[PDB]
Amino acid sequence: MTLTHPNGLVVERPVGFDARRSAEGFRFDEGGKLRNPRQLEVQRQDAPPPPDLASRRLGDGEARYKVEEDDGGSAGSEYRLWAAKPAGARWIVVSASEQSEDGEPTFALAWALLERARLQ
Amino acid sequence: MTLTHPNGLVVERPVGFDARRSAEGFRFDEGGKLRNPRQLEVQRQDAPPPPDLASRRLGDGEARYKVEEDDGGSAGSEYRLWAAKPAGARWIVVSASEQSEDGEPTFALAWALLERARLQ
Amino acid sequence: TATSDLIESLISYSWDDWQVTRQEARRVIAAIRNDNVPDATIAALDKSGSLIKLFQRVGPPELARSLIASIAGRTTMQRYQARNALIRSLINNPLGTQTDNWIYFPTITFFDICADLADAAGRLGFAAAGATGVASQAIQGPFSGVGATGVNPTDLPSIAFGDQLKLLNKDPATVTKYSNPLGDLGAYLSQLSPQDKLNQAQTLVGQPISTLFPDAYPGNPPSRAKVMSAAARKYDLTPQLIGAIILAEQRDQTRDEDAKDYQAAVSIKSANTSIGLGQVVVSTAIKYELFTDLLGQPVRRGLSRKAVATLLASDEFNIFATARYIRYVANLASQQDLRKLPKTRGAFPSIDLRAYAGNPRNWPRDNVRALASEYTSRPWDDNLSPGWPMFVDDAYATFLD
Amino acid sequence: TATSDLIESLISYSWDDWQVTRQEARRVIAAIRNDNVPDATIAALDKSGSLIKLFQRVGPPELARSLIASIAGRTTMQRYQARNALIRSLINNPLGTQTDNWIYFPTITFFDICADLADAAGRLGFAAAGATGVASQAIQGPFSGVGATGVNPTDLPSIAFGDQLKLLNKDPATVTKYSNPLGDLGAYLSQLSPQDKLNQAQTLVGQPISTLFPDAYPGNPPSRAKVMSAAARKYDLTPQLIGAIILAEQRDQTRDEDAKDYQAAVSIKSANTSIGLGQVVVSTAIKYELFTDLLGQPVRRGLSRKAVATLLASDEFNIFATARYIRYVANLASQQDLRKLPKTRGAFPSIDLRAYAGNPRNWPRDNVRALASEYTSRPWDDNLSPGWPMFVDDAYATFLD
Ligand SMILES: [Ca+2]
Ligand SMILES: [Ca+2]
Ligand SMILES: [Ca+2]
Ligand SMILES: [Ca+2]
Ligand SMILES: [Ca+2]
Ligand SMILES: [Ca+2]
Ligand SMILES: [Ca+2]
Ligand SMILES: [Ca+2]
């Protein structure tokens, strides 16, 4: 329903994904036997984002985001996302994979998982 | 708010228009000193529509309609709607006009006036 | 001639010289514009086989436009040689001038518009250059279109994809953004002082025309005022009538509306929008041949619909189109019978159908008011605009004084 | 030769006859293809000065395309002579063959492609006319792409304008419509009988190739089977492995994805989409030179990105590209450290990295599965498609019978 790690992090699980928790926090893989499964992942980070990160006004605060691209296969190129937002003294990081044929993916689901994510 | 003619016609007055009861019904002219004001017109009548005219469901009933277009001026072309729905053995008619530079207007208002009209 | 020789050395290739640079090209165009004997100069260049060369070697489209336009406009009995030379030049590289704003004029047609335009301008008295009066800096709201702004509608950025989409769905918050900006016309005038009114009028009329063929003119482009004067003369109007009609239109025009006006007319839809200074409607331009007095019949016949819509975004073409259509409306009214026009007599009791046949100076003020209605809408259908007559009438006051 | 003479009469001008009818051209393109001494004919045409005339006189791009394609691939000795004549006839940047689908191929590039292709099919064994095996009538949903359909993506209508805009706006419901049609791959396979599976396989492989260069072949185009065979021989695969990869691609492919696939590759965006039977990515075709075996170094260098995306929609070029890329992926795998690929071995424990260097006949099934994963995605990054290995394996079994 509404996952809540012990280390303070409280996120709202995405419909249709396997809720599976990792030491740092949570990890999300898309259910079904899909050709191109999306796969998010949330953690409570301490260290700040590297200097070069771009910015987008996400929600009411700001977000520091990086976007990778690599040669894939016939499902299109690999696209890895990376974005963090101010969470008190630390940050709430979202990590999202995806292949695409039609240029950079919107990441609607990876952003909604950062806009909602708060801390205890 | 709700106009009731002595011949049974009851319509809802479009917000922002001058209501003025005519012989067979009502006549609405758009409020203000506008360049391109909408002119609407509901009335009742025993006669049927002119022979041959497009049909279309108008909510739960039919509607006989025709849209004229003519040369106008800098404000666009003149568009005249002519629309009639059955009210049992009689008919409710709506007329409407307005200029458009951008092709045929929706006539959203004129239609909401035919759709909501009633007899009794 | 002297100018022939200078051009021959600027375009001629030598052992150590294989391109006509961008700067030699400019020197060439300058030399053509500043020549005292343009016809002889061209015959010379033809004699030497270098006329054709000249067209092939002055290269980027923007430069070819200036060259072609300067020669189309300055040359009388040699026009043909120049034109042939140019046709013969379009083999291989037929792109020519047909890029950007001029995408809808075939290079040869661009030549022909320039020649006719320069003839018209001299014959009708608007060839002479205009002091560079200042333009408004507005980019949004009423009076921010080309009238106020001098920024040509074909120069405006393409409407973003998001917006073109909402504009196809007919999403009203967006159709607003891009349609007429005023509602209460009276309310708008209330905010302007006698001075603000005057300032606008001067802003409108004092600018050089925003023209697509600047180099068809002997020098700098004419003031709009100059052009309105000339168009008044041709159609037995007054430049104050014309200006009042246009100022009325430009008050109810925004920069975005200019963008939408033009781009919808040259998009797939081929819209029948009202365009430019006087808000002339494309089909009406064609239907009433509103460029008659600036363009020969041959040239007009070949004009695509989209070329006509581009011409309306050129100030001189729009002014003349506006004037001719006004003289149309007034004329159409002279033949009408006032008895059959009850609501009209009602709204403008002093109206005088006969007087319309002649000059606006001998018109009752109700003839202007009525014509204002019958310009923003269908002429003489007994359906009147309630707010436009007072709105055009005010602008007329400002111009009369 | 008998043929050169017939042609000579058909293209010669007499008094008051200086045009080559459309009927005459067809008889000439016919006469060429029915020729038994096509090399001698050509030389006997050049000996008359008729050979330049020929290319000059056959004008409409569709017929020039057939004539050039035909002569390019029926000549050997005299091939250079015909190519000479062609260049000579290209006076003044004529259109030539460079219209329509072939718009990204300059006329000399079209000739030079039919030449290499005709030679490639003889040398590699796919020149022989394929049975006119029949195609599906489907126009949407899974398995409605060119593989099922025979309808080339470059013949598909332009994507409706409202839709183009939504796609540019990344509208979910609209991207859904023009992307991969399948979600749950297992479900898809369940809802097919083993007999439905067999029919898709037969329909894929049985049809004549959808080729952009039909007339480069001696008679009718080969069957996809025939081309796949030749391609498996060339890269040490088997036509069953090739087939299974493509059938899995074509199941996750619709008509609307075929249209999005190509049109986005050659629109202003120059997109990096997967195009054609084997769903090859445009940039990947270039980086790995996936046409090495049909076209020479000369021709390939010249090819614009869009030419390549357009070749990718030609079944034979696609099949060869697909096969080549597969052998690539297999090769890259024989060079790998299974110990540094823990997920990979977790998922396919019988995987035999060494045997990937040889023929698929000798691969463990788990090798077809892992290669499927690493064909739809990055090869050998130790991240896997969960669905694609069972999906391709299923197609494989169907072909193995
Ligand atoms: Ca030079
Ligand atoms: Ca306007
Ligand atoms: Ca307008
Ligand atoms: Ca009217
Ligand atoms: Ca003949
Ligand atoms: Ca696909
Ligand atoms: Ca694709
Ligand atoms: Ca992978």
Curated annotation (Swiss-Prot), chains A, B:
One annotated GO molecular function: metal ion binding
Region (Disordered): 28-60
Residues reported in the UniProt entry to bind Ca(2+): E101
Keywords: Calcium, Lipoprotein, Metal-binding, Palmitate, Signal
Coiled coil feature spans: none
Subunit structure: Forms a heterotetramer with Tse3 consisting of two Tse3 dimers and two Tsi3 dimers. Formation of the complex inactivates Tse3 enzymatic activity.
Keyword Calcium: yes
Protein name in UniProt: Immune protein Tsi3
Shown part of the complete sequence: 27 to 145 of 145
Keyword Metal-binding in record: yes
Primary role: Immunity protein that plays a role in preventing early activation of toxin Tse3. Occupies Tse3 substrate binding site and prevents the substrate from entering.
Swiss-Prot record, chains C, D:
GO cellular component terms, semicolon-separated: extracellular region; host cell membrane; membrane
Keywords: Calcium, Host membrane, Hydrolase, Membrane, Metal-binding, Secreted
Pfam families linked to this entry: T6SS_Tse3_cat, T6SS_Tse3_N
Cofactor: Ca(2+)
Activity modulation comment: Enzymatic activity depends on membrane binding.
Summary of the function given for this chain in its UniProt record: Toxin secreted by the H1 type VI (H1-T6SS) secretion system into the periplasm of recipient cells. Degrades peptidoglycan via muramidase activity thereby helping itself to compete with other bacteria. To protect itself, the bacterium synthesizes immunity protein Tsi3 that specifically interacts with and inactivates cognate toxin.
The organism's place on the tree of life at top rank: Bacteria
Annotated Ca(2+) 1 binding sites: N180, D252, Q253, E257
A molecular function GO annotation: metal ion binding
Subunit structure: Forms a heterotetramer with Tsi3 consisting of two Tse3 dimers and two Tsi3 dimers. Formation of the complex inactivates Tse3 enzymatic activity.
Protein name: Peptidoglycan muramidase Tse3
TM region positions: none
Reaction(s) this enzyme catalyzes, per UniProt: Hydrolysis of (1->4)-beta-linkages between N-acetylmuramic acid and N-acetyl-D-glucosamine residues in a peptidoglycan and between N-acetyl-D-glucosamine residues in chitodextrins
InterPro entries: Tse3_cat, Tse3_N
Binding site for Ca(2+) 2: E374, S377, R378, D381, N383
Enzyme Commission number(s) from the entry: 3.2.1.17
Compartments (UniProt record): Host membrane; Secreted
EC top class, as a word: hydrolase
